[PDB]
């Protein structure tokens, strides 16, 4: 599986999870977050060769089709599959408050 | 939203749904479906410039690439919402009818 467990220890040029750290203040201008100053969003990038990543039913059928039919349709690319929320802390006044932003962390990739 | 209704109306080169009918026996070698003989499966394709901001992550990356001098990923036009298809087969001499999940693509996203 194309997760941190595999992709961050091993050197790979095929479609994998790629590290990326985003400083809230300097990299987005999201001055309204007090904590944390940034976070590891990551992304998905690299090649999709033969049998590298399975996706849905639909990806399997497209690839079979593309082999059996003379006029192939579309070829797969590297995208996210499993996202994960991120809890941040901001202040109104001296008052703390917690919001859970959904789908902020890429935890795994796929070919589609 | 890049669904069947928007994208078919105007054939665009930017990311979109695209029509693709598929015959089971003729194009995948699936001789066991009694019926239907094919179906419009569709696919997703087209240019994605600097983002379909459905999910907050793709927004974050779209913005990061603007403000950071060293941008990260580029987007790509990929499936989004998938709906099943209802088949029919008889490998067992009696009529079966399941729903085959994730067989049609009804929308697309840049991601």
């Amino acid at each position, epitope marked *: 599986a194309l997760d941190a467990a595999y992709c961050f220890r091993n050197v790979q*040029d095929n479609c994998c999870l790629r590290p990326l750290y985003i400083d809230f203040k300097r990299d987005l201008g999201w001055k309204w977050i007090h904590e944390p100053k940034g976070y590891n969003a990551n992304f998905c990038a690299g090649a999709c060769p033969y049998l590298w990543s399975s996706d849905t039913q639909h990806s399997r059928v497209l690839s079979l089709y593309n082999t059996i039919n003379p006029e192939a349709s579309a070829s797969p690319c590297c995208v996210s599959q499993d996202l994960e929320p991120l809890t941040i802390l901001y202040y109104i006044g001296k008052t703390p408050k917690i919001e859970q932003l959904s789908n902020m962390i890429v935890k795994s990739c796929k070919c589609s | 939203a890049l669904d069947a209704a928007y994208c078919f109306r105007n054939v665009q080169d930017n990311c979109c749904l695209r029509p693709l009918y598929i015959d089971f026996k003729r194009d995948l070698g699936w001789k066991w479906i009694h019926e239907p003989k094919g179906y419009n499966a569709n696919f997703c394709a087209g240019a994605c410039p600097y983002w379909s901001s459905d999910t907050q992550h793709s927004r974050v990356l779209s913005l990061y690439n603007t403000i*950071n*001098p*060293e941008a990260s990923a580029s987007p790509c036009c990929v499936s989004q919402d998938l709906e099943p298809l209802t088949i029919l087969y008889y490998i067992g001499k009696t009529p079966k009818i399941e729903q085959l999940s994730n067989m049609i693509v009804k929308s697309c996203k840049c991601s």
Partner: antibody
Amino acid sequence: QQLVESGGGLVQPGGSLRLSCAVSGFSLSSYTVNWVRQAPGKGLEWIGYISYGGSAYYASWANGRFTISKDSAKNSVYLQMNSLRAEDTAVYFCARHMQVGGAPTGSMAAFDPWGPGTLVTVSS
Amino acid sequence: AQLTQSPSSLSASVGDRVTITCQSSQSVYNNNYLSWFQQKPGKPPKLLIYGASTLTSGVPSRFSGSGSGTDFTLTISSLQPEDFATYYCAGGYSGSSDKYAFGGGTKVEIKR
């Protein structure tokens, strides 16, 4: 860590050329690669880059004349220019970013290592 | 965004100390994405100073970067005969165009 440019020579006014940087000691999925050119006796000029994550950005004056691309199996990055005017006679270098991408700390506008340069002559 | 270098040309003696100033039309990202490069004729640019002030290891200490935001200077302390070269500054930016940009160069010629 090396970057060897190639693809260069003389080309007809208005034609097209594609150059290729051959990268050796590093992986293109950690390092951005940039293309900067300099006319004979003129200053350097950043034409653009292809990032560790696969994003290409260009100088504002490129105007879609240049496209930067990469292949990690081929270990190369490409600068494809079309519609060569006289202006674009120059030496072209590919320069790596100094630091890996996506790290909490960036490269600080620093390029390292550099390629030797390959001359490109636009003339009839 | 463009950035202007001064002076375009200058001559000084062995031992003397020289100042080159880069100046950015627009603020550079994080205020320290500005580097300085040595270019001998018929060579690629050598990297002297990254982050406006950090010195590349093995590049000699007689080079120093100071400045921030939009104004930066490089200072060569005890000019050497082998320090004749043209000297460029690069800077990083935000936006969807011109992420990086060089200066006009400064040819430094030694007095004899």
